[PDB]
Structure formats: C-alpha cells, structure tokens
C-alpha cells in the first residue's frame, strides 16, 4: 500500500464521461483558463436527485484523488460536506463502493493494492462522542499506554466506565448518557494528548501506536499527509476537528481546497444556526478591561513581537480617547433594547431617546431620557476593532515566527503579553468565522468601500440592571459579523473551489438559500454558471433517463379546494348516531373552535386526495405531505382518516394500508423499509402520511417491485424498483427560519432574515425598519409570517419546497402509466407565477406549473430607496464627524474620495464594486425623477414612475453643460479627469449625492479653476475648521488669511463660523461666491452678518455670480473687484 502501486496506472484511461461529468468538468477548465489556478470558485449544479447526481459527484471526487496521485508521482484537501450525518456516511460508503467496483472496458479499474491505497486516503470525521464510541477497547488501551496516560487514575476510571457502559447501553436514555460521557471523555483525553505533544515530552508515533491514534484522531491522518479526503457534516466543517497537536479549522486553510457541498442551498440555514450561537458580551466591561489592560501592559523588546505594537497603537489611542470622552471610570446607572445593522438602521425599544450624562461628585454616569446609541455604537466599533487587530496580530506573529497550532499559540502569547486572557474565547470564535474575512479592506463601513449587509452583520444590545448589584447596568451585546452568504463568499475568496450540488441551488430566495445576487456582485467571474448549451445537454440527459412522453406516462395534476359538504358527510358517517358534524369534529376529533375552520379545510383537502387516489384502479403507492405529523398526538384525527380509508377501500374493492406516524423518529425506530416490504409482498394500495421536513434529503422512498402485484401498470421510462405514483402536496407553511438554541439566537435569526430581505430589495427600507421595530418589541411568530408573506421571496421559497418534494418523489425509472398529483389549491396562485427557464424542471414540477397556468421592477424601487437612505445617513454621520477634530485624518480622505468619485463618474455602466451605495439603478438610463425631503425622513422617498412630476436628477438639473462649455473650467475638468457630461448608463447617483455633494463639488471646482486662471492659489483648510470653508486662498501681496465658501442660498451660522475661524487664526477675509448666476446683481460686502456695509469696513465679500449661466462668460469685473478688495487690506 504505497504511491508506487500507481506507477503503471494509466491516468488517461477513464470511464466514458456522462453529460453531467462534462458539465462539471468543462466549466472548471474554463475557470482555470480565465481566473487561473488557486483562484477559488462557486459552481452551483442543479442536478435532479436520483439521476446520477451522487454518482457524478463521487466520480469527480475520485478523479481529483487520481489527479493528486498523479501529481505525487510526478513530483490538496478534498471535502464532502452535507448537513446530515447519515448522508455523509452514505456518501463515503458509496465512494468506497465506486472505488471497489468501477470498471473501464470490461476490467476492474483499480487493482486490489490500488483500491486499498485509495480507500486509505479517505477519512470520515464524526462528532467526538461517536468518534470515541467507534474505537475498540484495544485502540483506547494502546493510546493510553503509549502516552503513559493510563497511570492517571481519573482517565483510566472514566474509560473503564465508558467501556462497561458501551457493552449494554441499549436503553435510549442510557445511550444518551453514554454519548454525553463519551463526548466529555474524548474532549479531556484529546486535551491531555495535545498538551503532551506540545511539550518537550513529545511522544514519537509509529507502528501500532500511530495506527491507534489515527483511528482515534482521523484529523491526525489529515495532518500528517496520510489522507486528504474528508467526509464530514457542515457543522463539523465549521467547528473543525482535532489532531494530535491542536484543533484544525478548515475555514482558516481553504487555499486550494476542493469542497463538494451536497444540498448547497440547505447549508445556508446550517451556517446561520452556527453563526447565531455566539455569546453576548457586556460592552461596558469589555471596554473597561481593554482600556485598563492596555494602560497596564505596554511593550516587550523581542524579535517575535516586531511589527505588533504599531497595530495596537491606534487602538490604544482610541481606547484612551473613548474612556476620557465618556468617562468610563465612572459607574453606569439609570430593559432597553437597541438594534442596529451598523449602517442606516438604528431601532430602539425606548420611546424617548436615552442620553448619558456624567456626575463627577457622584462619580457616576446616568442614563436618562451624549446619546446612549452613540455610546454603544462606539464601544461596539472598538470591540470589533480590537478583535480585528488580534486577527492581524496573530497573522503577523506567524510571519515573525516563520497556521493552526501556531495560530492558537500566537493568540495565547499575544493575550498573555497584553494581559487580556478574558477575551481568548471571543478571539477564537471571532477568528474561526470572521477571521476568514477577505473583505477586510473591502469594507470598513466606509462609503468608499463595497457596502453590504452580508459582510456587515447586525448588532443587538440589551441594557438592564446588573444582577447582584442593581446600582449599575450592563450592556449585553450580541451581534453577527457576517451572513451565510458572506461566509460562502469568504470561502470562495480564500481559494476554495465549491461545487454546490442541488436541484434548486439557485432558488432565488435569500431566506432559504444564499443571496446569489450578493454572491454575483461579490465574486464576478469566480461564480461559475452553466451555459445554455450545457443546460440543454443536462436536459437531454434527463429526458433520456426520464422519457415520460414516449412511454405514455401521463401526469395528472388536480388542484383541490376545501370541500365542506364532503367532509361533513364523512364526519356524519363516522359516529353515525350523532347530530352535528361541527360537534363530531369538536368532540370526537378533539379540535378547538379557534382551529376548527383551518382543520376543516386541510382535512377536507387531504381526504379528497385520498378518495381520488383510492378510486383510481392502477395507482398503488401514495404519499401525503402535510406540514404536521399525524402521530399519536393527533390519534383522534388518525382514527377518522382510517375510517374514511376503510370506507373507500370497501367501496372500491381494493385493500389499503395506512402509515400515519411516518416521521424521523419513526424512520429511525421502525424504518421506512416496512412500507417497501408491504408494497413488495402485499396486494393493494398504500397511503403514507408524512411531512416535508420528515421526507428530507437522503430518505429514499423506493420499493422493490413484485410484478405479480403490479398488474400491467408499470412501464420502464428509461431509454428493479418503483417509486411513489400518487402524491398530495399541502402548501408549505412556517417558511420563516427560527432558532431554538436560545432567545438571543432566535432574535439574531429573525433580524438576519429581515435585513437579508431588505438587502435583496424584497422589502422597502420603510417596511424593513417597521418590521425590525416590531420584532424588537416582540412581535408574534404569526405576525412575522404575515410580514414575510408580502414578499415574493416567500413565493420563491414555497416553490422551492414544492419542487424539492416532487423531485424527491421521482427517484426510479419504473413509472406507472398514470401519476396522480393532488395539490392544495392554495398553491395554485404561487405556482402560476413560476417563470424561470423550465429546461431543468422535473416532469412533475413542469406539470404542476402548467396546470396552474421576484419582479425586478419591485426590487428597483426598494433598492433605490435603500441606497438613498444609506447615502443620506452615512453622509450625515460623516459630516458630523468632519465637524469634530480628532477623526479628521481618515474622514477627510473619505470625503475627498466620495467627491472625486462623484465628479469623475456621475454615472457608471456597471454596478460598482466600491462606492456601490453612491448610485442607484435608474430604470431610465442617465436620468430619473424622485420626491422626498432630503432634510426629512429618508423612508418617504419615491422614485421613477411613482413620481412623474417630481424632481429630476440629470445633467441638465446641475447645469454642467452650461458650465464646461467655453470657459477655463473645461481644461481643469479634462486635466483632473472629471466628467464633462453624463454618460447615459443605468446606474446614476442617488438624490442625496446629487444635491448635497455633487452640485457643491462642481461649484468648488469651477471656482478654483476660474480663480487659478487669475493667478490665485489654494491650500487645504486645516483640520480644525475643515469642511466649514471650501479652501484657503493665497494671493501675492496679502499676508492676512483668506477663506472661501462656495455654497448657494446659505446652504445665521455663518457669523458663528466667522467668529470661530477668527478666534483661532486671527483677523481674516472671507469670500462668498456662487459659481454660476448672473452678473446683473452687484457685488456685496458684509461684516460677520447678513447686513452689508462699505467695502473697507467689511470682512466678508459676496460675489453673487462668478459665471454668467446665460453664456458662461467669466465675470472678470467681479474678479478685479475682489482683487482690489483683497489688496486694500
């Protein structure tokens, strides 16, 4: 068993590729040609289940293994990930079968030695409890003796107890207790082994000890190069797995890894559940500890920590500044709930904006009706800033030492050096997921960056009196730093090649699937897609495998309405010696009045479906998919359903067997094989009552065919097993994700869903903010569902569920000559809206859509409102910060970047990566109408056709054409690259950018050009008074400072500005000038007030119009007057 076994192997000899194999392979070749090797990519693969999807995935995996072997001979980690453990085990077993049984041209592809070598390269990584319980007592004894750990009495005693329990733990409760004990024992034992291996007593592993350890720790085989293929669940993949040295997190090491994800769309929910688990942190304590410990511990002059202290110096500065400004030394005293998406959404449970004041004599900070929101927002930014710095520091610590054991070593060393051990967990769970962030410089929450919720997350803060000491409060904050789509995008950016294999992998729903609009914008060419030709090839393959029409298989779809009289007659026959069907339903079926109407409707639909099924002569196997389990808790309804089934069986003379509690637990304990056995051995029909959740991926409803019982109804539909031939589809319900790990986890899940809908454009910012507010105050599940049902994302999710069900019901090639699909009439409207390309739809889904017989327009309005609101609030905050001194260094650059972007690209062809919030998709190409008070509520804006007579954003409304026509400003614009005209593209700047920034920037640039044409020159305003005045004017012969301000219509604070400028910079002259206007009105002079005076007594000179808009002539007389007034002193 060695690589030498393949020396004579022919790596060019392969099985005849199927169309699916080509569809997988050739996009990857194209990607490598386009993006090059080690790029990373996401390749959704809408393969229908049952038709060779698992075989093709495993064949691709095996081909990658063979490529690895070939490279090893001539001179990469492979992951198979899915949500379910049993699916992982089945996939691994199928890969082993494929290795053992694959044949090419009539002979086994791999020799027994090659088969053994390949099977040795594959690893399965279950949870720790199962990993321990799978190990034989011999392996554990060998491991304990080899590490001389058996001398430790606690370990030996616990292992003996586990071994004793394992031999007879058949009782489910005893089994659960054994699982918990085994998990804890595995944790302790691996901790001890890692500690022993880290020290100078490192045990040399070889022979039997090495094999035993590898059996106990497959991650050890991964680590030491013995294996490179891992089969594990998504939960284990996110959690990481242990080796002899430390815990290994695949996320931190995805460079070059190939990652096959089965049921890709389902992994969104799993990743969200993992993200929502992270603990709530008390921000006040966190910042207090950070500031105190950064003051306490200062430096160390050692080579290892080179380039580290400079990373934290800004954090030290801002920690001290924040502590001084908010007086963190004082105790905080007066629950209040604050929610924020960190960008444009800020909701609070309090009706009155709470504020913070400091009482020095009391030595306390008092919260009463400095805003509280600003305090927590600043603290959160610092807290995230600290964690982000740790990530950078840990990386740098490696480069100094030179990423898994060294990573934890670096974290521990840095925290000990700075004396911040209390944050070690926060840092670890931050680095695991958020530490994979490749868009670190891609978003600092700046407008100049690429802004999106999916790599911004959300924050939720609870303010309440501290337990044990009510004199103080604690600000417990829980947050998300990314969404599942953000995690996937970071995985692809790290270099992973991801194969998302799932029918409906592009379901077009951000709740039940990754946001593929965001993924497209974020990845570009890295998000691979199947061309029309490849999709046609896949469709042809599917039709060849499922040739319904040529074989005469008829799909009969029947939409069913509530049948009250039919149910009434059935109820009156059940308990015939009764009076009222309402009483029978209430008393005997045990249905309360609050649910009587709903139960009547869905029970009547189900019973109509069953009656139609039993009436049909040939059909034998029916599956009923409800939203609820008809288990013992509903035995009263099961009795009535059984009565109806017996009635109809006697009426139509056909035996019928009902399976009611078909459920995950029932599938585990009784097994779905009972239904298959009954169908294979017993004559008659079968009705199976299950749910969409119970019939999840991997549950195979096939049954072995016995032609004696099938009559002549079966027909082979391919160019011995059969599947469901009748199905009832209840409308999927409860389509909003929920988390039961904890209350805060559920809150994070709900807010993530709301913000994802707002980001996708499915909710207007007004509706999104209202929903966030209602959620914060504690709205009911039913009201959340009502809010969700208004979006088209809900309909997309419902269609996804229906498609998944019908696809999962069609796993064989033997079909009955008629297939009965019964559908709740509530699905008719939803399915009639299906408008996607039907090339990859299954026959059942196509029939469903035909029998029924997310608007980009809606998204455009919502996204225009969202971008305008984000721009408005971001610019307001940025200007407010610019009116503060210390933050000027970065905010000035942000301001200049925004202005330069708008001047240079007023309109762009493609959705920008950066500055994406500066623009909206106009729907009118280069212009658009809008209404809204830019100084008022951003939620009130309306755009495009909704306001035909509203204000317009266009090249005409800014007078750029009249400005850059025959003047000195055109050379200025051409030299600096500014746009002399608006290209008529789809993306146009938002109203806020047009009105508050672009039009002022044009005036500033025009004034600068015109004045520089007359020997003037300018320098940047000092940070103390930045953005209060445009520029500082320098002219020969004048020593007094001169300030310029180009703003129209006073866009009384001018006197305050003048006083503030003069008190610092002494006496000065001020220039007020409008770039465009008319020369007809005289120049004016003023003295720190709107009242004018004589020229020499005035310090403020107003030039009403530097340029005549009628023909763009330069008002040279005004310039000469200005020069004379300057020289007069």
């Amino acid at each position: 068993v060695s690589i030498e076994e393949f020396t004579h192997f022919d790596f060019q000899l392969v099985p005849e590729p199927s169309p699916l194999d080509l569809v997988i392979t050739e996009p990857l070749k194209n990607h490598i040609e386009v993006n090059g090797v080690k790029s990373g990519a996401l390749l959704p693969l809408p393969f229908q289940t049952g038709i060779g999807k698992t075989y093709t995935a495993l064949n691709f995996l095996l081909q990658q293994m063979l490529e690895q072997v070939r490279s090893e001979l001539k001179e990469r980690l492979l992951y198979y990930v899915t949500d379910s453990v049993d699916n992982v085990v089945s996939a691994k077993a199928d890969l082993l079968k494929l290795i053992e049984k694959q044949t090419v041209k009539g002979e086994p592809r791999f020799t027994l030695e090659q088969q053994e070598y390949l099977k040795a390269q594959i690893v399965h990584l279950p949870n720790q409890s199962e990993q321990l319980l799978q190990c034989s007592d011999a392996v554990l004894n060998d491991v304990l003796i080899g590490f001389n750990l058996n001398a430790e009495r606690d370990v030996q005693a616990e292992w003996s107890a586990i071994s004793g329990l394992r031999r007879h733990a058949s009782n489910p409760e005893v089994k659960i207790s054994l699982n918990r004990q085994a998990g804890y024992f595995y944790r302790n034992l691996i901790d001890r082994l890692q500690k022993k291996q880290k020290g100078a007593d490192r045990v040399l592993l070889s022979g039997s000890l090495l094999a035993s350890v590898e059996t106990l720790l497959p991650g050890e085989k991964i680590r030491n190069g013995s294996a490179h293929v891992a089969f594990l669940t998504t939960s284990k993949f996110l959690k990481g797995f242990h080796n002899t040295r430390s815990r290994y997190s695949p996320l931190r090491d995805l460079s070059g890894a190939v990652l096959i994800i089965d049921e890709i769309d389902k992994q969104n929910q799993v990743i969200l559940s993992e993200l929502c688990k992270q603990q709530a942190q008390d921000l006040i304590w966190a910042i207090r500890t950070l500031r105190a410990n950064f003051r306490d511990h200062q430096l160390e002059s050692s080579p290892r920590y080179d380039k580290i202290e400079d990373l934290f110096e800004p954090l030290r500065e801002r920690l001290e500044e924040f502590g001084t400004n908010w007086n963190l030394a004082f105790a905080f005293n007066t629950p209040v709930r604050l929610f924020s998406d960190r960008s444009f959404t800020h909701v609070s449970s309090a009706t009155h904006k709470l504020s913070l004041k400091s009482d020095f004599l009391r030595r306390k900070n008092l919260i009463f009706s400095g805003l509280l929101t600003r305090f927590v927002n600043e603290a959160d930014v610092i807290y995230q800033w600290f964690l982000g710095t740790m990530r950078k520091a840990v990386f740098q610590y490696w480069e100094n030492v030179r990423l898994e054991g060294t990573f934890q070593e670096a974290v521990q060393s840095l925290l000990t050096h700075f004396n911040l051990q209390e944050f070690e967990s926060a840092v670890y769970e931050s680095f695991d997921t958020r530490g994979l962030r490749q868009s670190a410089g891609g978003k600092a929450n700046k407008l100049s960056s690429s802004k999106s919720y999916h790599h911004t997350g959300l924050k939720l803060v609870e303010v309440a009196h501290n337990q044990g000491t009510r004199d103080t409060v604690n600000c417990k904050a829980s947050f998300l730093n990314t969404s599942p789509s953000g995690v996937l995008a970071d995985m692809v950016d790290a270099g992973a090649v991801i194969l998302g294999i799932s029918a409906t992998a592009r379901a077009d729903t951000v709740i039940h699937n990754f946001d593929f609009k965001y993924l497209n914008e974020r990845l570009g060419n890295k998000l691979l897609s199947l061309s029309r030709e490849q999709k046609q090839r896949v469709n042809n393959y599917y039709h060849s495998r499922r040739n319904y029409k040529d074989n005469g298989v008829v799909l009969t779809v029947k939409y069913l309405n509530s049948r009250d009289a039919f149910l009434d007659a059935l109820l009156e026959e059940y308990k015939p010696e009764a009076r009222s069907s309402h009483f029978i339903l209430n008393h005997y079926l045990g249905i309360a009045e609050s649910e009587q109407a709903f139960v009547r409707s869905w029970l009547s639909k189900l019973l109509a479906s069953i009656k139609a099924f039993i009436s049909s002569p040939d059909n034998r196997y029916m599956l009923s998919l409800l939203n609820r389990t008809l288990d013992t808790t509903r035995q009263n309804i099961n009795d009535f359903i059984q009565f109806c089934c017996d009635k109809w069986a006697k009426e139509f003379n056909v035996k019928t067997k009902t399976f009611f509690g078909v459920n995950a637990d029932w599938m585990r304990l009784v097994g779905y094989d009972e239904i298959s056995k009954h169908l294979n051995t017993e004559l008659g029909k079968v009705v199976v009552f299950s749910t969409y959740a119970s019939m999840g991926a991997g549950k195979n409803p096939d049954y072995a065919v016995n032609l004696a019982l099938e009559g002549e109804s079966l027909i082979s539909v391919a160019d011995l097993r059969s599947d469901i031939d009748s199905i009832y589809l209840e409308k999927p319900t409860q389509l909003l994700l929920s988390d039961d790990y904890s209350h805060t986890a559920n809150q994070l899940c709900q807010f993530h869903q709301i913000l994802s809908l707002q980001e996708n454009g499915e909710l207007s910012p007004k509706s999104a903010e209202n929903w966030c507010r209602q959620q914060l105050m504690g709205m009911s599940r039913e009201r959340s569902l009502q809010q969700y049902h208004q979006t088209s994302d809900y309909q997309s999710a419902v269609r996804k569920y229906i498609e998944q069900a019908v696809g999962r019901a069609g796993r064989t090639s033997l079909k009955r000559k008629q297939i009965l699909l019964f559908v709740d009439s509530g699905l008719k409207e939803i399915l009639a809206e299906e408008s996607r390309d039907p090339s990859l739809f299954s026959h059942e889904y196509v029939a469903l859509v035909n029998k029924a017989k997310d608007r980009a327009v809606r998204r455009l309005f919502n996204l225009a409102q969202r971008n305008n609101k984000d721009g408005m609030l971001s610019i307001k905050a940025l200007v407010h910060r610019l009116h503060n001194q210390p933050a000027s260094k970065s905010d000035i650059q942000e301001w200049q970047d925004i202005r330069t972007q708008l001047l240079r690209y007023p309109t762009v062809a493609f959705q920008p990566e950066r500055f994406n919030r500066l623009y909206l998709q106009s729907m009118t190409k280069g212009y658009y109408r809008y209404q809204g008070n830019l100084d008022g509520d951003p939620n009130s804006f309306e755009f495009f056709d909704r306001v035909p007579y509203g204000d317009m954003v266009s090249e005409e409304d800014c007078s750029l054409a009249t400005l850059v026509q025959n003047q000195y400003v055109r050379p200025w614009f051409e030299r600096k690259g500014f746009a002399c005209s608006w290209q008529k593209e789809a993306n146009v700047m938002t109203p806020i950018m047009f009105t508050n920034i672009y039009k002022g920037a044009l005036g500033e640039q025009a004034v600068e050009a015109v004045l520089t044409a007359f020997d003037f020159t300018f320098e940047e305003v000092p940070n103390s008074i930045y953005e209060r005045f445009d520029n500082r004017v320098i002219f020969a012969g004048i020593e007094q400072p001169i300030w310029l301000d180009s703003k129209y219509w006073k866009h009384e604070g001018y006197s305050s500005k003048i006083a503030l400028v003069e008190e610092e910079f002494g006496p000065s002259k001020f220039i007020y000038v409008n770039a465009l206007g008319d020369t007809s009105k005289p120049i004016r002079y003023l003295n720190s007030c709107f009242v004018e005076t004589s020229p020499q007594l005035a310090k403020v000179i107003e030039i009403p119009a530097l340029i005549d808009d009628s023909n763009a002539d330069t008002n040279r007389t005004a310039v000469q007057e200005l020069i004379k007034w300057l020289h007069h002193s």
Binding site: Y559, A565, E577, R579, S581, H582, F583, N586, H587, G590
Partner: protein, 657 residues
C-alpha cells in the same frame, strides 16, 4: 302575530296521561321546627334519591317547604325517615308549569335537570377528560309579568371531579356515551363547575355563519329546536310548550345611515370645544396618549396633550389600573377628582386603547368622546345635539347605591337624585325627603322596584297627576323565527350535498349567454375535470348578490340543486326579533337589537323590557326617549336618555360629597 320570545303562551299537559304513566308524591318534614327544617333539607333530597327509583323532584311554594316527587307508575315512594309527611298526589293537583318542569327533568331517563352538550374542550397537560359546555333547559316564573313562565337556555359547564371539599361533595354528573345529554350520576366523575370564575363559557344565541345547519345546531336556539323535538319524542302530543309572540305595533329599524348621521352630528358639536389628554401613570407609556390623540385626529377634533388637567376643557385622564392600588389614597384618578371638582373630564386605562390584535381600538375613542359630550351636556345643563322631545312636566329620579357592601344595604334608604327640564335648561337636584315619601306613596305596590333591594331602578314621575313609569328588564329573551330558519338551513344542507352535473352548467351557459355569471362558470369549468360533477364548494366564489347571480342560482334551484338563497331579507323577517327598536304602547313592552343586516353569528338575545306605569294609556312622548343612538354606542338603547344624563350627574356628585 309578532316576534317570538321565550315567554310561554301555553303549556298543554294531559294530566290523565301523566297519571296513567307516572306517580306523584308530596313531601314535607313532619313535626320539625321551621328553624331546623332547613338544616335537614340538606339531606332530605339525597335520602329521597337514595330511597329507590325516583325520576326527579321539584320544589313547591316556598311557604310549604315541600317537594313534588315523580316516580314510575308502579313504583311507590318509601322513605325510612318517619319524620317526613308523605302524600300520594294526582298530576292535576300540581301547577301546570311545575308539572312541566318535572316532566322536563325526566326526559333524559324517559328516553338536576336537562342539559344538552354543545361544545367540549380538552383539559391541559397532566389531566384527562373534557370541559363540557352545555345548554340547560328549564322553566322559571316571570316575576315581572304576574308569574307567567319563561323557557331558560342558560349555559352551564361541567368539569371532571379529579380536576376543595365542597367541589368533591357535588352532584357527580355524567356525560352520555352518545354525548347528546349530561345527567346526574353517583360516580360519574363530573362536577358542574368551570376552571375559574373567569373565562366564562358562552354559547351563541344563533349561528348561520355559512348557512350551515350543523353549526346552527350548536347555538342556544338550535338546542331549543332540538329540545322541542325531544319533548315530542318523549311524550308525543301529551306534553307540549308553545312560546308566546309579542303583539307587534311598532318596529323601528336602524340603518347604518341613521347612526352615521347621528354621530357626525355628535362629533361636530365636540369640534367647537377644547380637548386635552393627560397621563397619571407611574411608568408613563406615552404611546397610549399618542394613540388616543391619533384616533381623535381621524375624527377631526382639536386635541392636545398636557401634563396636568386644565379647568374648563374636556380632559381625558389616562390613569393606572385600580387593581394595582390597595386603597383610594393610591389612586391618582380619585386624587385629582377630589381637587378638580368643577370640570368635565374622562378617564381610561392605557391598555384598552388596542384590540387583541394589537391594532388601535377606535370604539374606545368614540365612546370616550360620546361620554365627554354627555358629561359636558350635564355640566352646562343644556343639550348640545338634538334630543327628541320627552314627556312634558315630568320629573326623573334615580336612587344611588351607598358605598357599603353589607347585606343590610338591601333595605336601607338610599340617596335619590332628580332631574327636570324647565324651558331649555336641565335642573339637577337631590330629592328631598318629602318628595321621596310622596313618590313612595304614589308608586303603591311598585315601590319595591325603586326603594328595595340592590336593584333600585330610576323612575319617571308626574307631580301634577301622580303618574309614574318604571322601566323593568323582564328577563324574557326575544327569539328569531328559528323554526323557519332551521327549515331553510336543512333545505340548503340537503341541496348542497349533491354535486352538480356539468351538463346543467353547460345548459345554463347555452340558455343565458347574456348572463355575466358565464364569465365565471367558463373559468371554473376550464379548471375542472369534464367527467366529474362540480361540488357546491366550486361555486362559492359566485356570490348570491347580483341580479344575474341570483337568476343563475334560482335556475339551479329549479333543476333540483338548492345551493344559495336569501335568508336575512326584510320580506322574510326571520331576524326581526333581534334588530332595531321594537315598542308596543298598549301593553308597554319594548326591546332593542342591532342595526342593519343581522350578523351571521349573534351572541345574545335582546331582552324584553316592560314599562310599568299608572297611565290608562302611556304618553306618546315616552317613545321619543329611546330614539338615541349614542347612549348605547352606535346601537339602539333600552334606557331613556334622561336617565343616562341623571346617572352621569349622580356620578359627578360623588367627589363633591
């Protein structure tokens, strides 16, 4: 004949048939003192029920402390206690209604009393059984109408015995295997008690939600029809009860238009005054005040929020719930009332401003505004909107209950307040003792209604003639034409049970191409199997509203498919007994119901009110006192508006005492 009511016109019992079928006994204690006989009646009945095959027993006249006992024809009463006087009796010796009650109690066995199960609720976890909600049928004398008889249909609940000592020692009721009836049993593991005194179980008076006969059967009136069937089943024609119809003279109806005009007139009068909103709660949820203001805003009334009451303005004081306070000193409402003793203002709790769904409740706001207007009219002692002329020269009086809660308050004299209309101004005063003595003398036998018991009713008095008028709730319930409604519902039930062949729909489309129902029928058929007849549920979207739809449904009826019909049209008049305001001058009875069309689910019966007076013929102006649609919010009232104003005045004077 007029609207139907629970008042019994006649009870027909064949006393000879009863004697041929049952044996009756009279029982009373012999020799025991009347002070101790109550102490042994605790056992008397149980001993009688332990004696043998006793069907049931019914109390006689209270003065006798006796019982009438019913046993089979061949059985004989045998009580081991010799201290009891026993006497075989003939059925003819009993009052007809008492024998009827005995027979009713015996229906469960022939086929404490007769209970029909209507609705059950499963108990919470850790418990088994049902909470049974039943309709009890029993006769009761009508004290207001000379001991005429009424047929009660009260709701009464049963719970498992398993779910105090008194609860353990109660009639161990039992439910039937069929579940049609609930009857007393020795070890029947059921007690006639709900979970709390709260969450009172109720049963709809009528229910025709979807013209569903089965849902109609589960209302009080459906149970009444079933009881009328069971009476004939048990006794055929030998026993029968006929419900009396109130003779109809005048039956005013009330459309939404009239009420809307009245309320726009009302709101306009309030637009001329200043309104203020206050909040005296500790944890001030100012959102309550904001919601109140916004609700008032939708009515276009100038309102504002102030931190304290303002004299001379219409102030609404949002105050904390009284249940959170242990004494009047802790209540801000009473504290401010004691201070602001000469200003009109209203109060309400913050929670009432939103409905169960959380939406703002506008009925609360409108009721607050109407109460403010009424209080302002009392304060200014002049009408601000048009009130129809009342009787001339009359004086209104209203006894007020003292604050004491002891049982002796039943007989204590009470303070009495009076109001009078002179010209246009309303005079309000506290009645002098001489006036009260004169009124008591004049009322004669009716004085007990005004000066005895806790139920002291206001009285209209005519000093110039001594005439009076008292408005008494008789307790009689007005019933719709439930026999006819039940017949129609059964006809619809039979018709809707048959699926309509597609042939008839095609024939209709052929025959009436101009009909606009065809646009719907073609779509329905295209979305249906050409081989299967259409069940009625497919046509449900085709409402019985337009003329063409009515013609289509009538045409289907001629084919034998009776699917939809008119039930609540005024021509039918089934629901007259629960609509508008009905009044009869000659006999002085009246009742009030709803406005507009009857809602499909009516939860209550309008009571019949009796005006007791001394006139040979009641003055016509008395009718005018009820044409007021804001005393009872947006509905006809059963109380004269002068009494509403006088009650408001009496309430205002509480803090001036």
């Amino acid at each position: 004949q007029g609207p139907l009511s629970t008042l019994i016109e006649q009870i027909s019992i064949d006393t000879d048939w009863v004697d041929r079928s049952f044996a009756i006994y009279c029982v009373s204690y012999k020799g025991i003192d009347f002070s101790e006989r109550p102490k042994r009646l605790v056992t008397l009945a149980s001993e009688t029920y332990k004696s043998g095959s006793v069907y049931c027993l019914v109390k006689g006249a209270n003065k006798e402390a006796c019982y009438w006992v019913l046993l089979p024809k061949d059985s004989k009463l045998d009580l081991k206690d010799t201290s009891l006087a026993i006497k075989p009796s003939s059925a003819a010796e009993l009052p007809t209604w008492q024998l009827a009650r005995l027979l009713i109690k015996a229906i469960p066995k022939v086929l404490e009393g007769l209970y029909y199960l209507v609705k059950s609720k499963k108990l919470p976890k850790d418990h088994s059984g049902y909470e049974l909600t039943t309709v009890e049928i029993d006769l009761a004398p009508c004290a207001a109408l000379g001991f005429k008889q009424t047929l009660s249909m009260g709701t009464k609940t049963f719970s498992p015995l398993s779910w105090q000592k008194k609860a353990r020692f109660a009639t161990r009721y039992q439910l039937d295997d069929v579940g049609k009836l609930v009857s007393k049993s020795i070890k029947g593991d059921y007690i006639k008690k709900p979970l709390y005194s709260n969450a009172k179980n109720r049963i709809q008076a009528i229910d025709i939600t979807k013209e569903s006969y089965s849902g109609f059967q589960l209302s009080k009136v459906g149970i009444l029809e079933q009881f009328m069937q069971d009476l004939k089943q048990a006794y055929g024609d030998s026993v029968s009860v006929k419900l009396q119809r109130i003779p109809g003279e005048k039956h005013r109806f009330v459309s939404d238009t009239i009420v809307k005009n009245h309320y726009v007139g009302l709101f306009d009068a309030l637009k001329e005054h200043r309104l203020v909103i206050c909040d005296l709660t500790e944890n001030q949820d100012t959102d309550a005040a904001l919601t109140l203001l916004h609700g008032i805003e939708h009515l276009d009334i100038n309102a504002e929020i102030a931190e304290v009451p303002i004299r001379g303005a219409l102030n609404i004081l949002i105050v904390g719930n009284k249940d959170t306070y242990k004494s009047d000193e802790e209540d801000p409402y009473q504290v401010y009332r004691k201070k602001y003793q000469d200003t009109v203002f209203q109060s309400c709790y913050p929670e009432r401003l939103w409905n169960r769904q959380g939406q703002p409740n506008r009925h609360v706001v409108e009721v607050l505004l109407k109460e403010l207007l009424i209080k302002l009219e009392v304060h200014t002692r002049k009408h601000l909107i048009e009130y129809p002329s009342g009787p001339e020269r009359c004086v209104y009086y209203m006894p007020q209950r003292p604050k004491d809660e002891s049982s002796e308050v039943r007989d204590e004299p009470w303070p009495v307040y009076a109001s009078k209309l002179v010209g246009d101004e309303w005079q309000y005063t506290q009645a002098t003792q001489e006036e009260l003595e004169d009124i008591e003398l004049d009322l004669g036998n009716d004085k007990r209604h005004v000066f005895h018991g806790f139920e002291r009713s206001p009285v209209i008095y005519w000093p110039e003639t001594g005439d009076y008028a008292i408005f008494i709730d008789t307790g009689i319930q007005m019933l719709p034409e439930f026999e006819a409604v039940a017949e129609r519902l059964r006809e619809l039930k039979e018709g809707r049970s048959q699926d309509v062949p597609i042939a008839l729909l095609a024939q209709f489309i052929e025959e009436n191409p101009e009909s606009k129902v065809i646009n719907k029928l073609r779509a329905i058929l295209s979305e249906w199997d050409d081989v299967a007849p259409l069940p009625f549920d497919e046509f449900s979207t085709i409402a019985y509203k337009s003329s063409d739809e009515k013609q289509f449904y009538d045409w289907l009826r001629e084919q034998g498919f009776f699917l939809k019909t008119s039930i609540r049209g005024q021509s039918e008049g089934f629901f007259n007994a629960s609509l508008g305001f009905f009044y009869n001058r000659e006999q002085g009875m009246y009742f009030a119901g709803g406005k507009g069309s009857p809602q499909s689910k009516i939860e209550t019966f309008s009571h019949l009110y009796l005006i007791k007076h001394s006139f040979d013929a009641l003055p016509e102006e008395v009718e005018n006192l009820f044409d007021v649609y804001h005393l009872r919010h947006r509905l006809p009232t059963v109380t004269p508006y002068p009494f509403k104003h006088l009650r408001e005045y009496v309430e205002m004077q509480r803090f001036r005492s």
